Design an enzyme around this catalytic site. Structure first.
Site, PDB file in Angstrom:
ATOM      1  N   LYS A  10     -44.071  31.287  23.073  1.00 36.82           N
ATOM      2  CA  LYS A  10     -45.440  31.430  22.592  1.00 36.82           C
ATOM      3  C   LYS A  10     -45.474  31.403  21.069  1.00 36.82           C
ATOM      4  O   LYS A  10     -44.479  31.650  20.381  1.00 36.82           O
ATOM      5  CB  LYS A  10     -46.079  32.739  23.047  1.00 36.82           C
ATOM      6  CG  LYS A  10     -45.439  33.988  22.504  1.00 36.82           C
ATOM      7  CD  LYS A  10     -46.310  35.235  22.735  1.00 36.82           C
ATOM      8  CE  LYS A  10     -47.629  35.145  22.014  1.00 36.82           C
ATOM      9  NZ  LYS A  10     -47.511  35.872  20.722  1.00 36.82           N
ATOM     10  N   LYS A  15     -39.764  31.112  17.266  1.00 42.97           N
ATOM     11  CA  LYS A  15     -39.069  29.865  17.569  1.00 42.97           C
ATOM     12  C   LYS A  15     -38.446  29.250  16.329  1.00 42.97           C
ATOM     13  O   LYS A  15     -37.274  28.858  16.339  1.00 42.97           O
ATOM     14  CB  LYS A  15     -40.016  28.853  18.204  1.00 42.97           C
ATOM     15  CG  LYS A  15     -40.482  29.244  19.583  1.00 42.97           C
ATOM     16  CD  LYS A  15     -41.397  28.200  20.203  1.00 42.97           C
ATOM     17  CE  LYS A  15     -42.594  27.847  19.347  1.00 42.97           C
ATOM     18  NZ  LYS A  15     -43.497  29.026  19.161  1.00 42.97           N
ATOM     19  N   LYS A  41     -47.946  23.380  13.598  1.00 44.67           N
ATOM     20  CA  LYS A  41     -47.795  24.159  12.371  1.00 44.67           C
ATOM     21  C   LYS A  41     -46.907  23.440  11.359  1.00 44.67           C
ATOM     22  O   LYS A  41     -47.085  23.610  10.142  1.00 44.67           O
ATOM     23  CB  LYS A  41     -47.253  25.547  12.708  1.00 44.67           C
ATOM     24  CG  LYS A  41     -47.453  26.589  11.625  1.00 44.67           C
ATOM     25  CD  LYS A  41     -47.454  27.986  12.216  1.00 44.67           C
ATOM     26  CE  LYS A  41     -47.376  29.062  11.141  1.00 44.67           C
ATOM     27  NZ  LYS A  41     -46.003  29.228  10.579  1.00 44.67           N
ATOM     28  N   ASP A 129     -47.518  27.419  24.166  1.00 45.11           N
ATOM     29  CA  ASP A 129     -48.622  28.241  24.638  1.00 45.11           C
ATOM     30  C   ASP A 129     -49.407  27.500  25.705  1.00 45.11           C
ATOM     31  O   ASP A 129     -50.103  28.128  26.512  1.00 45.11           O
ATOM     32  CB  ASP A 129     -49.562  28.465  23.468  1.00 45.11           C
ATOM     33  CG  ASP A 129     -48.893  29.222  22.359  1.00 45.11           C
ATOM     34  OD1 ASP A 129     -48.787  30.463  22.378  1.00 45.11           O
ATOM     35  OD2 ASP A 129     -48.466  28.497  21.432  1.00 45.11           O
TER      36      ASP A 129
HETATM   37  N1  ADP Z   1     -35.614  38.518  14.219  1.00 42.68           N
HETATM   38  C1  ADP Z   1     -36.609  38.640  13.318  1.00 42.68           C
HETATM   39  N2  ADP Z   1     -36.703  39.668  12.444  1.00 42.68           N
HETATM   40  C2  ADP Z   1     -37.716  39.772  11.557  1.00 42.68           C
HETATM   41  N3  ADP Z   1     -38.715  38.875  11.473  1.00 42.68           N
HETATM   42  C3  ADP Z   1     -38.732  37.809  12.308  1.00 42.68           C
HETATM   43  C4  ADP Z   1     -37.664  37.630  13.281  1.00 42.68           C
HETATM   44  N4  ADP Z   1     -37.924  36.493  13.948  1.00 42.68           N
HETATM   45  C5  ADP Z   1     -39.074  35.985  13.454  1.00 42.68           C
HETATM   46  N5  ADP Z   1     -39.528  36.764  12.465  1.00 42.68           N
HETATM   47  C6  ADP Z   1     -40.748  36.532  11.698  1.00 42.68           C
HETATM   48  O1  ADP Z   1     -41.784  36.286  12.661  1.00 42.68           O
HETATM   49  C7  ADP Z   1     -42.689  35.306  12.114  1.00 42.68           C
HETATM   50  C8  ADP Z   1     -42.853  34.197  13.141  1.00 42.68           C
HETATM   51  O2  ADP Z   1     -41.611  33.544  13.363  1.00 42.68           O
HETATM   52  P1  ADP Z   1     -41.652  31.965  13.641  1.00 42.68           P
HETATM   53  O3  ADP Z   1     -40.221  31.561  13.845  1.00 42.68           O
HETATM   54  O4  ADP Z   1     -42.465  31.266  12.579  1.00 42.68           O
HETATM   55  O5  ADP Z   1     -42.499  31.889  15.022  1.00 42.68           O
HETATM   56  P2  ADP Z   1     -42.934  30.568  15.838  1.00 42.68           P
HETATM   57  O6  ADP Z   1     -42.142  29.432  15.234  1.00 42.68           O
HETATM   58  O7  ADP Z   1     -42.514  30.924  17.243  1.00 42.68           O
HETATM   59  O8  ADP Z   1     -44.434  30.462  15.682  1.00 42.68           O
HETATM   60  C9  ADP Z   1     -42.096  34.861  10.794  1.00 42.68           C
HETATM   61  O9  ADP Z   1     -42.786  35.587   9.773  1.00 42.68           O
HETATM   62  C10 ADP Z   1     -40.678  35.338  10.751  1.00 42.68           C
HETATM   63  O10 ADP Z   1     -40.259  35.751   9.476  1.00 42.68           O
HETATM   64 MG    MG Z   2     -42.719  27.614  14.399  1.00 42.29          MG
END
Ligand code: ADP
Ligand code: MG
Ligand code: ADP
Ligand code: SF4
Ligand code: SF4
Ligand code: MG
Lengths: 277, 277
Positions: A10, A15, A41, A129
């Site tokens: 999600k 990811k 994104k 999603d």
């Molecule tokens: N293991 C973790 N510890 C701290 N922050 C995290 C961790 N994994 C992800 N984040 C934070 O969560 C947010 C979303 O992560 P992201 O990889 O961009 O999600 P997605 O790609 O699934 O939309 C980012 O701000 C990232 O810094």
């Molecule tokens: Mg992403």
């Protein structure tokens, strides 16, 4: 041979952070890796490229005329550890199917010979999603043989994992797309690891790694870096190294057993998640 | 007259909890309300109906033959406070467009006269992680004139708010769809209210309410109830009553000003969100 893997989950679950850090760890090991961003994104490669983001194939094709006027050498960009990076892009909100750019990008990459024998891994970072249009294409069209789902004890994150698993089951008659595992991106809640292990067992897979919540991620990302690059000695860097090792060694690729909403709710109640304060 | 409102936001942000509690508060006030679930999760009415979920129009049409064999009286279900509830449903993952059921449902409801003069509000609870297909239909086809976006200091939640706003701008030449406000569903982080107020000001709207994070929500939902029904004296019940009052009184409906990713990142850095421990 190269292993074609897709990271689903999600929105906001981790990811892109997990994929880029995992891939940096793979590169640190000596693997040759390409990341293909399949999320509108379009920031799935910024930590490898030290960048704001990356211009997308859809954007570059529009400026060049057609996608066929693009050259692979102008589209793919190399960053940390020589990891090669590309972003699909997608239409603006309200216009056309949000996943249309994924189809264009993957077909462009295949036609242009991006899948060179020397690559060891390709990772697609795919919005999860909804499982439709171009976001379903890696599964429907047999592009990612190993699906890893980033998830957490959040009910929505586990529901997404189940829906992605249903999509894998739907296309099992053809191609070879399989669920390779769940990756728990921790919310810092009690028994979360046990909860995701239980969910994985119900789906027929495994929790390949529990990624702790660690603010070093934010500090690295503010500087446009993976933790692997930003602080190779960080405890969290070793976490991503452990995840990468287990992905390399993983041999369990299954046709998953999607569960009912009753089973999900029982999982949450059982592990006192919804009752933690 | 009836006010047609849609609640958008990224998955898991609190759309269905906020909508059902807001609507329960409206019903407690004496308003007549219908909720139309437009999220494939299809649990947007369970807390009004005291139910697991609700069978969807797509499911009921398939069992009846065609959607035209369905009667409105068999589809709409009334729960707490007389609130009327319907779920769109959607295709299974990997099959067809995840939003297709929203188009079928809204058209069915319009044709069958569900929009009776006596209704005061209709709320659509719409998946917002992509703005396309049936999920864009409430905006594209002028079905929800007032869009409220549930969001939080999460970067992904604010990105979704911006993307939904871009969809509103895209269709501003026709119909009358406008952004009515942001609703901050708190992650219990410092300065979060200030952050969402700042985002709202940049978009041209307002933060209509800051909803605190409160475990009474989980306790009510385990019992299939809104907080309004479960514990009318709860502090959180008064929060939803305040949100409902402000929605009733809201007169600011704008064509929003989508921001750049640079502006979003500056907002997060400014309010020390990514730097909170
Ligand atoms: N293991 C973790 N510890 C701290 N922050 C995290 C961790 N994994 C992800 N984040 C934070 O969560 C947010 C979303 O992560 P992201 O990889 O961009 O999600 P997605 O790609 O699934 O939309 C980012 O701000 C990232 O810094
Ligand atoms: Mg992403
Ligand atoms: N203000 C709140 N306080 C505590 N828990 C909340 C709050 N709002 C939402 N939740 C919880 O967050 C989860 C997701 O909310 P939900 O309304 O289902 O999200 P969405 O409909 O946007 O996917 C639910 O478990 C719900 O109990
Ligand atoms: S969901 Fe996006 S276009 Fe079908
Ligand atoms: S994104 Fe779902 S079908 Fe277009
Ligand atoms: Mg919902």
């Amino acid at each position: 041979a190269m292993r074609q893997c897709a990271i689903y989950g999600k929105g906001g679950i981790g990811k892109s952070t997990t994929t880029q850090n995992l891939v940096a760890a793979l590169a640190e090991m000596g693997k040759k890796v390409m990341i293909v961003g399949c999320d509108p994104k379009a920031d799935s490669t910024r930590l490898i490229l030290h960048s704001k983001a990356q211009n997308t194939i859809m954007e570059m094709a529009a400026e060049a005329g057609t996608v066929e006027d693009l050259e692979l050498e102008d589209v793919l960009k190399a960053g940390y550890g020589g990891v090669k990076c590309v972003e699909s892009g997608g239409p603006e909100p309200g216009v056309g199917c949000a996943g249309r750019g994924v189809i264009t990008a993957i077909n462009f990459l295949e036609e242009e010979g991006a899948y060179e024998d020397d690559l060891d891994f390709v990772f697609y970072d795919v919005l999860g999603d909804v499982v439709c249009g171009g976001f379903a294409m890696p599964i429907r069209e047999n592009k990612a043989q190993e699906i890893y789902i980033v998830c957490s004890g959040e009910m929505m994150a586990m529901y997404a994992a189940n829906n992605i698993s249903k999509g894998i089951v739907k296309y099992a008659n053809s191609g070879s797309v399989r669920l390779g595992g769940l990756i728990c991106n921790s919310r810092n809640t009690d028994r979360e690891d046990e909860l995701i292990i239980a969910l994985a067992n119900k789906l027929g897979t495994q929790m390949i790694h529990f990624v702790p919540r660690d603010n070093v991620v934010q500090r690295a990302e503010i500087r446009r870096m993976t933790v692997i690059e930003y602080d190779p000695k960080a405890k969290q860097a070793d976490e991503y190294r452990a995840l990468a090792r287990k992905v390399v060694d993983n041999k369990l690729l299954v046709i998953p057993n999607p569960i009912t909403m009753d089973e999900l709710e029982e999982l949450l109640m059982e592990f006192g998640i919804m009752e933690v304060e």
